[PDB]
Design a protein around this ligand. Structure first.
Ligand SMILES: C/C=C/C(=O)SCCNC(=O)CCNC(=O)[C@H](O)C(C)(C)COP(=O)(O)OP(=O)(O)OC[C@H]1O[C@@H](n2cnc3c(N)ncnc32)[C@H](OP(=O)(O)O)[C@@H]1O
Length: 352
Protein backbone atom coordinates (compact mmCIF):
# COMPACT_ATOMS: atom_id res chain seq x y z
CA UNK A 1 0.00 0.00 0.00
CA UNK A 2 0.97 3.59 -0.79
CA UNK A 3 2.65 5.64 1.92
CA UNK A 4 2.24 9.43 1.59
CA UNK A 5 5.31 11.65 2.20
CA UNK A 6 5.73 12.63 5.87
CA UNK A 7 5.73 16.36 4.99
CA UNK A 8 5.20 18.82 2.10
CA UNK A 9 4.77 22.51 1.33
CA UNK A 10 1.25 23.99 1.45
CA UNK A 11 -0.31 27.46 1.73
CA UNK A 12 -2.37 28.15 4.79
CA UNK A 13 -3.26 30.89 7.26
CA UNK A 14 -1.39 30.92 10.60
CA UNK A 15 -2.72 31.77 14.13
CA UNK A 16 -2.20 35.49 13.40
CA UNK A 17 -4.46 35.83 10.35
CA UNK A 18 -1.52 35.78 7.90
CA UNK A 19 -1.28 33.85 4.63
CA UNK A 20 1.76 31.60 5.13
CA UNK A 21 3.96 29.27 3.12
CA UNK A 22 4.11 26.15 5.34
CA UNK A 23 7.11 23.91 4.57
CA UNK A 24 6.27 21.14 7.02
CA UNK A 25 2.58 20.60 6.12
CA UNK A 26 1.11 17.11 6.41
CA UNK A 27 0.07 14.96 3.44
CA UNK A 28 -3.45 13.60 3.19
CA UNK A 29 -4.38 9.94 3.56
CA UNK A 30 -5.48 8.17 0.39
CA UNK A 31 -9.23 7.42 0.41
CA UNK A 32 -10.16 4.09 -1.25
CA UNK A 33 -12.49 5.87 -3.68
CA UNK A 34 -10.09 8.68 -4.64
CA UNK A 35 -6.68 9.11 -6.26
CA UNK A 36 -3.49 10.78 -5.00
CA UNK A 37 -2.36 13.83 -6.95
CA UNK A 38 1.05 15.46 -7.25
CA UNK A 39 -0.08 19.04 -8.00
CA UNK A 40 1.46 20.59 -11.10
CA UNK A 41 -0.61 23.77 -11.56
CA UNK A 42 -3.17 25.77 -9.55
CA UNK A 43 -5.52 28.65 -10.28
CA UNK A 44 -6.21 31.58 -8.00
CA UNK A 45 -9.84 32.47 -7.16
CA UNK A 46 -11.22 35.49 -5.28
CA UNK A 47 -12.66 33.00 -2.75
CA UNK A 48 -9.06 32.09 -1.74
CA UNK A 49 -8.32 35.72 -0.87
CA UNK A 50 -11.40 35.91 1.35
CA UNK A 51 -10.39 32.98 3.60
CA UNK A 52 -9.47 35.20 6.55
CA UNK A 53 -10.76 36.30 9.97
CA UNK A 54 -13.74 34.11 10.94
CA UNK A 55 -13.57 32.52 7.49
CA UNK A 56 -10.10 31.03 8.07
CA UNK A 57 -9.22 27.76 9.78
CA UNK A 58 -5.60 28.13 10.93
CA UNK A 59 -3.33 25.38 9.48
CA UNK A 60 -6.02 24.19 7.04
CA UNK A 61 -4.99 24.27 3.33
CA UNK A 62 -6.07 27.02 0.95
CA UNK A 63 -7.05 26.64 -2.71
CA UNK A 64 -9.85 25.27 -4.83
CA UNK A 65 -8.47 24.75 -8.39
CA UNK A 66 -5.76 22.14 -9.08
CA UNK A 67 -4.34 19.99 -11.91
CA UNK A 68 -1.73 17.28 -11.45
CA UNK A 69 -0.34 13.79 -11.97
CA UNK A 70 -1.86 10.69 -10.41
CA UNK A 71 0.76 9.00 -8.17
CA UNK A 72 -1.45 6.40 -6.44
CA UNK A 73 -4.99 5.08 -7.03
CA UNK A 74 -7.53 4.16 -4.34
CA UNK A 75 -8.43 0.48 -4.35
CA UNK A 76 -12.11 1.10 -5.34
CA UNK A 77 -11.32 3.43 -8.26
CA UNK A 78 -11.81 2.32 -11.85
CA UNK A 79 -10.63 3.82 -15.15
CA UNK A 80 -7.68 5.75 -13.71
CA UNK A 81 -4.04 4.54 -13.93
CA UNK A 82 -0.97 5.73 -12.02
CA UNK A 83 0.66 8.45 -14.18
CA UNK A 84 -2.70 9.77 -15.58
CA UNK A 85 -3.36 13.54 -15.48
CA UNK A 86 -6.38 14.90 -13.59
CA UNK A 87 -7.95 18.26 -12.75
CA UNK A 88 -10.59 19.12 -10.19
CA UNK A 89 -11.76 21.19 -7.25
CA UNK A 90 -10.93 21.03 -3.58
CA UNK A 91 -13.05 22.33 -0.73
CA UNK A 92 -10.76 24.87 0.86
CA UNK A 93 -10.42 25.26 4.62
CA UNK A 94 -12.79 22.54 5.78
CA UNK A 95 -11.88 21.91 9.45
CA UNK A 96 -12.83 18.25 9.10
CA UNK A 97 -10.26 17.85 6.24
CA UNK A 98 -7.56 20.47 6.92
CA UNK A 99 -5.02 18.46 4.86
CA UNK A 100 -7.02 18.85 1.62
CA UNK A 101 -6.57 22.03 -0.44
CA UNK A 102 -5.39 22.78 -3.98
CA UNK A 103 -2.45 24.87 -2.74
CA UNK A 104 -0.34 21.91 -1.73
CA UNK A 105 2.30 19.69 -3.39
CA UNK A 106 0.09 16.59 -2.79
CA UNK A 107 -3.67 16.43 -2.59
CA UNK A 108 -6.40 13.85 -3.18
CA UNK A 109 -9.32 14.08 -5.56
CA UNK A 110 -12.67 14.96 -3.87
CA UNK A 111 -16.14 13.45 -4.50
CA UNK A 112 -16.38 13.04 -8.26
CA UNK A 113 -15.67 16.76 -8.80
CA UNK A 114 -12.71 15.95 -11.05
CA UNK A 115 -11.86 14.51 -14.43
CA UNK A 116 -8.98 13.29 -16.59
CA UNK A 117 -7.27 16.20 -18.38
CA UNK A 118 -7.91 15.93 -22.14
CA UNK A 119 -4.77 14.98 -24.16
CA UNK A 120 -4.62 18.45 -25.85
CA UNK A 121 -4.77 20.56 -22.68
CA UNK A 122 -1.82 21.60 -20.48
CA UNK A 123 -1.84 21.52 -16.64
CA UNK A 124 -2.30 25.32 -16.65
CA UNK A 125 -5.26 25.27 -19.05
CA UNK A 126 -6.88 22.50 -16.98
CA UNK A 127 -6.26 24.17 -13.57
CA UNK A 128 -8.16 27.26 -14.79
CA UNK A 129 -11.42 25.29 -15.17
CA UNK A 130 -12.76 23.55 -11.97
CA UNK A 131 -14.27 26.41 -9.87
CA UNK A 132 -15.68 27.81 -13.16
CA UNK A 133 -17.35 24.57 -14.18
CA UNK A 134 -18.68 24.02 -10.68
CA UNK A 135 -19.99 27.57 -10.18
CA UNK A 136 -21.64 27.66 -13.64
CA UNK A 137 -23.49 24.42 -12.88
CA UNK A 138 -24.70 25.58 -9.46
CA UNK A 139 -25.95 28.83 -11.02
CA UNK A 140 -27.83 27.10 -13.85
CA UNK A 141 -29.32 24.66 -11.28
CA UNK A 142 -30.47 27.59 -9.13
CA UNK A 143 -31.88 29.53 -12.11
CA UNK A 144 -33.89 26.40 -13.03
CA UNK A 145 -32.05 25.90 -16.34
CA UNK A 146 -31.16 22.38 -17.54
CA UNK A 147 -27.52 21.39 -18.05
CA UNK A 148 -26.32 20.89 -21.62
CA UNK A 149 -26.40 17.48 -23.23
CA UNK A 150 -22.86 16.16 -23.74
CA UNK A 151 -24.28 14.48 -26.90
CA UNK A 152 -26.50 16.08 -28.62
CA UNK A 153 -25.18 17.56 -31.86
CA UNK A 154 -26.65 20.88 -31.01
CA UNK A 155 -28.60 23.10 -28.62
CA UNK A 156 -32.33 22.71 -27.94
CA UNK A 157 -34.63 25.03 -29.88
CA UNK A 158 -37.04 27.38 -28.11
CA UNK A 159 -40.45 28.91 -28.86
CA UNK A 160 -38.91 32.40 -28.91
CA UNK A 161 -35.46 33.55 -27.70
CA UNK A 162 -34.94 32.95 -23.98
CA UNK A 163 -32.54 35.58 -22.68
CA UNK A 164 -30.33 35.31 -19.61
CA UNK A 165 -28.72 38.45 -18.24
CA UNK A 166 -25.15 37.93 -17.01
CA UNK A 167 -23.99 40.91 -14.97
CA UNK A 168 -20.18 40.78 -15.10
CA UNK A 169 -19.71 38.93 -18.37
CA UNK A 170 -15.89 39.14 -18.33
CA UNK A 171 -15.63 37.33 -14.95
CA UNK A 172 -14.07 33.83 -14.85
CA UNK A 173 -17.48 32.42 -13.84
CA UNK A 174 -19.41 34.17 -16.68
CA UNK A 175 -17.17 33.10 -19.56
CA UNK A 176 -17.72 29.40 -18.62
CA UNK A 177 -21.42 29.93 -17.74
CA UNK A 178 -22.20 31.67 -21.07
CA UNK A 179 -20.81 28.73 -23.11
CA UNK A 180 -22.91 26.34 -21.06
CA UNK A 181 -26.05 28.53 -21.40
CA UNK A 182 -25.63 28.57 -25.18
CA UNK A 183 -25.18 24.79 -25.33
CA UNK A 184 -28.53 24.51 -23.45
CA UNK A 185 -30.27 26.78 -26.01
CA UNK A 186 -30.32 30.07 -24.02
CA UNK A 187 -29.13 33.49 -25.24
CA UNK A 188 -26.81 35.29 -22.80
CA UNK A 189 -26.62 39.06 -22.84
CA UNK A 190 -23.71 40.50 -20.87
CA UNK A 191 -22.47 43.64 -19.14
CA UNK A 192 -18.75 44.37 -18.58
CA UNK A 193 -16.04 46.92 -19.51
CA UNK A 194 -15.53 47.76 -23.24
CA UNK A 195 -12.04 46.22 -23.45
CA UNK A 196 -13.56 42.81 -22.57
CA UNK A 197 -16.40 43.07 -25.11
CA UNK A 198 -14.69 40.72 -27.62
CA UNK A 199 -13.98 38.16 -24.86
CA UNK A 200 -17.69 38.18 -23.81
CA UNK A 201 -18.90 37.69 -27.40
CA UNK A 202 -16.35 34.89 -28.04
CA UNK A 203 -17.75 33.09 -24.98
CA UNK A 204 -21.42 33.20 -26.00
CA UNK A 205 -22.89 36.67 -25.28
CA UNK A 206 -25.34 37.71 -28.00
CA UNK A 207 -24.85 41.34 -27.09
CA UNK A 208 -22.56 42.98 -24.61
CA UNK A 209 -23.00 46.36 -22.90
CA UNK A 210 -20.87 48.68 -20.79
CA UNK A 211 -22.36 48.38 -17.26
CA UNK A 212 -21.59 52.06 -16.69
CA UNK A 213 -23.97 53.21 -19.54
CA UNK A 214 -26.77 55.60 -18.44
CA UNK A 215 -30.21 53.90 -18.17
CA UNK A 216 -28.78 50.62 -19.46
CA UNK A 217 -31.54 48.71 -17.59
CA UNK A 218 -34.07 50.40 -19.94
CA UNK A 219 -31.91 49.33 -22.90
CA UNK A 220 -31.94 45.72 -21.63
CA UNK A 221 -35.68 45.77 -20.81
CA UNK A 222 -36.31 46.97 -24.39
CA UNK A 223 -34.00 44.33 -25.88
CA UNK A 224 -35.66 41.51 -23.91
CA UNK A 225 -39.25 42.66 -24.68
CA UNK A 226 -39.80 43.44 -21.01
CA UNK A 227 -39.83 39.73 -20.32
CA UNK A 228 -36.33 38.94 -18.97
CA UNK A 229 -36.85 36.13 -16.47
CA UNK A 230 -33.25 35.17 -15.62
CA UNK A 231 -30.44 37.31 -14.08
CA UNK A 232 -27.10 35.88 -13.04
CA UNK A 233 -25.11 38.37 -11.00
CA UNK A 234 -21.37 37.59 -11.10
CA UNK A 235 -20.31 40.88 -9.44
CA UNK A 236 -22.58 40.65 -6.38
CA UNK A 237 -22.60 44.12 -4.83
CA UNK A 238 -25.15 46.88 -4.10
CA UNK A 239 -25.08 48.25 -7.70
CA UNK A 240 -25.30 44.90 -9.46
CA UNK A 241 -28.33 43.79 -7.43
CA UNK A 242 -30.11 47.11 -8.20
CA UNK A 243 -29.31 46.77 -11.93
CA UNK A 244 -30.52 43.14 -12.12
CA UNK A 245 -33.82 43.88 -10.32
CA UNK A 246 -34.41 46.79 -12.76
CA UNK A 247 -33.66 44.72 -15.92
CA UNK A 248 -36.00 41.80 -15.01
CA UNK A 249 -39.32 41.81 -16.85
CA UNK A 250 -42.74 43.08 -15.76
CA UNK A 251 -44.00 39.53 -15.15
CA UNK A 252 -41.18 38.69 -12.68
CA UNK A 253 -37.97 36.74 -12.92
CA UNK A 254 -35.28 34.90 -11.02
CA UNK A 255 -32.16 36.60 -9.60
CA UNK A 256 -29.15 34.39 -8.67
CA UNK A 257 -25.98 35.81 -7.14
CA UNK A 258 -22.58 34.20 -6.49
CA UNK A 259 -22.50 35.57 -2.91
CA UNK A 260 -25.02 36.35 -0.17
CA UNK A 261 -26.70 39.81 -0.30
CA UNK A 262 -28.41 42.20 2.13
CA UNK A 263 -40.17 45.43 -6.22
CA UNK A 264 -42.22 42.27 -6.41
CA UNK A 265 -42.31 39.04 -8.40
CA UNK A 266 -38.59 38.20 -8.25
CA UNK A 267 -37.33 35.03 -6.58
CA UNK A 268 -33.71 35.03 -5.31
CA UNK A 269 -30.93 32.53 -4.54
CA UNK A 270 -27.14 32.50 -4.25
CA UNK A 271 -24.57 29.79 -4.91
CA UNK A 272 -22.98 28.04 -1.92
CA UNK A 273 -19.73 26.52 -3.31
CA UNK A 274 -19.15 23.36 -1.14
CA UNK A 275 -22.62 22.35 -2.23
CA UNK A 276 -20.93 20.96 -5.36
CA UNK A 277 -19.40 18.24 -3.14
CA UNK A 278 -22.74 17.34 -1.48
CA UNK A 279 -20.99 18.70 1.50
CA UNK A 280 -22.45 21.60 3.42
CA UNK A 281 -20.76 24.32 5.36
CA UNK A 282 -19.92 24.69 9.03
CA UNK A 283 -19.76 28.51 8.79
CA UNK A 284 -22.56 30.38 10.69
CA UNK A 285 -24.57 33.30 9.20
CA UNK A 286 -26.27 32.36 5.88
CA UNK A 287 -23.58 29.72 5.07
CA UNK A 288 -24.03 26.70 7.36
CA UNK A 289 -26.13 23.92 5.84
CA UNK A 290 -26.18 20.07 6.02
CA UNK A 291 -24.70 18.06 3.12
CA UNK A 292 -26.89 15.95 0.87
CA UNK A 293 -26.69 12.97 -1.44
CA UNK A 294 -28.77 14.88 -4.07
CA UNK A 295 -26.20 17.72 -3.98
CA UNK A 296 -23.40 15.16 -4.31
CA UNK A 297 -25.04 13.48 -7.32
CA UNK A 298 -25.67 16.82 -9.01
CA UNK A 299 -21.97 17.65 -8.74
CA UNK A 300 -21.02 14.21 -10.18
CA UNK A 301 -23.48 14.61 -13.07
CA UNK A 302 -22.26 18.15 -13.82
CA UNK A 303 -18.64 16.94 -13.91
CA UNK A 304 -19.47 13.97 -16.11
CA UNK A 305 -21.17 16.45 -18.55
CA UNK A 306 -18.60 19.25 -18.38
CA UNK A 307 -15.69 16.77 -18.58
CA UNK A 308 -16.95 15.61 -21.94
CA UNK A 309 -17.58 19.18 -23.12
CA UNK A 310 -14.02 20.17 -22.25
CA UNK A 311 -12.76 16.97 -23.94
CA UNK A 312 -14.52 17.85 -27.22
CA UNK A 313 -13.54 21.51 -27.11
CA UNK A 314 -17.08 22.79 -26.60
CA UNK A 315 -16.22 24.27 -23.21
CA UNK A 316 -12.97 26.33 -22.96
CA UNK A 317 -10.94 27.91 -20.13
CA UNK A 318 -10.98 31.61 -19.26
CA UNK A 319 -7.87 33.48 -20.68
CA UNK A 320 -4.77 32.73 -18.60
CA UNK A 321 -2.05 34.68 -16.93
CA UNK A 322 0.53 31.99 -16.16
CA UNK A 323 3.26 32.47 -13.52
CA UNK A 324 6.11 29.91 -13.04
CA UNK A 325 7.15 29.56 -9.43
CA UNK A 326 6.55 28.11 -6.00
CA UNK A 327 4.25 28.71 -3.08
CA UNK A 328 5.22 32.32 -2.42
CA UNK A 329 4.08 33.03 -6.01
CA UNK A 330 0.62 31.68 -5.09
CA UNK A 331 0.70 34.00 -2.08
CA UNK A 332 1.61 37.02 -4.28
CA UNK A 333 -0.99 36.01 -6.89
CA UNK A 334 -3.67 36.01 -4.20
CA UNK A 335 -2.78 39.64 -3.34
CA UNK A 336 -3.00 40.68 -6.99
CA UNK A 337 -6.41 39.02 -7.15
CA UNK A 338 -7.55 40.58 -3.84
CA UNK A 339 -6.65 44.04 -5.13
CA UNK A 340 -8.77 43.56 -8.30
CA UNK A 341 -5.65 43.87 -10.50
CA UNK A 342 -6.91 41.22 -12.94
CA UNK A 343 -9.32 41.87 -15.79
CA UNK A 344 -10.39 39.29 -18.37
CA UNK A 345 -7.77 36.78 -17.17
CA UNK A 346 -7.31 34.01 -14.61
CA UNK A 347 -4.06 33.78 -12.65
CA UNK A 348 -2.51 30.28 -12.82
CA UNK A 349 0.73 29.21 -11.09
CA UNK A 350 2.70 26.40 -12.67
CA UNK A 351 4.63 24.93 -9.77
CA UNK A 352 8.29 24.63 -10.68
C1 LIG B 1 -15.02 24.83 -6.06
C2 LIG B 1 -15.79 26.10 -5.79
C3 LIG B 1 -17.04 26.13 -6.29
C4 LIG B 1 -17.98 27.29 -6.10
O1 LIG B 1 -19.15 27.22 -6.47
S1 LIG B 1 -17.48 28.72 -5.39
C5 LIG B 1 -19.08 29.53 -5.27
C6 LIG B 1 -19.11 30.92 -5.94
N1 LIG B 1 -18.87 32.00 -4.98
C7 LIG B 1 -17.71 32.41 -4.43
O2 LIG B 1 -16.65 31.86 -4.70
C8 LIG B 1 -17.72 33.59 -3.45
C9 LIG B 1 -16.34 34.30 -3.35
N2 LIG B 1 -16.06 34.84 -4.67
C10 LIG B 1 -16.31 36.07 -5.11
O3 LIG B 1 -16.81 36.92 -4.40
C11 LIG B 1 -15.94 36.40 -6.54
O4 LIG B 1 -15.46 37.75 -6.67
C12 LIG B 1 -17.09 36.14 -7.53
C13 LIG B 1 -17.52 34.66 -7.44
C14 LIG B 1 -18.28 37.07 -7.31
C15 LIG B 1 -16.55 36.46 -8.91
O5 LIG B 1 -15.34 35.71 -9.12
P1 LIG B 1 -14.86 35.36 -10.60
O6 LIG B 1 -13.62 34.54 -10.42
O7 LIG B 1 -15.99 34.75 -11.39
O8 LIG B 1 -14.55 36.73 -11.40
P2 LIG B 1 -13.17 37.48 -11.76
O9 LIG B 1 -12.39 37.73 -10.49
O10 LIG B 1 -12.51 36.85 -12.97
O11 LIG B 1 -13.83 38.87 -12.21
C16 LIG B 1 -13.20 40.14 -12.11
C17 LIG B 1 -13.92 41.06 -13.08
O12 LIG B 1 -15.05 41.63 -12.44
C18 LIG B 1 -15.36 42.93 -13.02
N3 LIG B 1 -15.70 43.86 -11.91
C19 LIG B 1 -15.02 44.00 -10.73
N4 LIG B 1 -15.66 44.92 -9.95
C20 LIG B 1 -16.75 45.33 -10.64
C21 LIG B 1 -17.80 46.22 -10.37
N5 LIG B 1 -17.87 46.92 -9.22
N6 LIG B 1 -18.77 46.40 -11.29
C22 LIG B 1 -18.75 45.72 -12.45
N7 LIG B 1 -17.78 44.85 -12.75
C23 LIG B 1 -16.76 44.65 -11.87
C24 LIG B 1 -14.15 43.35 -13.79
O13 LIG B 1 -14.45 43.16 -15.17
P3 LIG B 1 -14.31 44.35 -16.28
O14 LIG B 1 -15.23 45.47 -15.82
O15 LIG B 1 -14.73 43.72 -17.57
O16 LIG B 1 -12.84 44.68 -16.27
C25 LIG B 1 -13.12 42.31 -13.35
O17 LIG B 1 -12.23 42.06 -14.42
Amino acid sequence: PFIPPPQQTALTVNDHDEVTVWNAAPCPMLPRDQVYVRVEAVAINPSDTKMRGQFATPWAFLGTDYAGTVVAVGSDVTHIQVGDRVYGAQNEMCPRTPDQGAFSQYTVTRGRVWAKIPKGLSFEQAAALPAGISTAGLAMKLLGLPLPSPSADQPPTHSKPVYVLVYGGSTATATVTMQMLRLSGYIPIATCSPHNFDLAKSRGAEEVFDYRAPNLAQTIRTYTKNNLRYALDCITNVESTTFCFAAIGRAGGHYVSLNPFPRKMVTTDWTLGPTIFGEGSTWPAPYGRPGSEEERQFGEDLWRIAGQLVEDGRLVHHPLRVVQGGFDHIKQGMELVRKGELSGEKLVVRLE
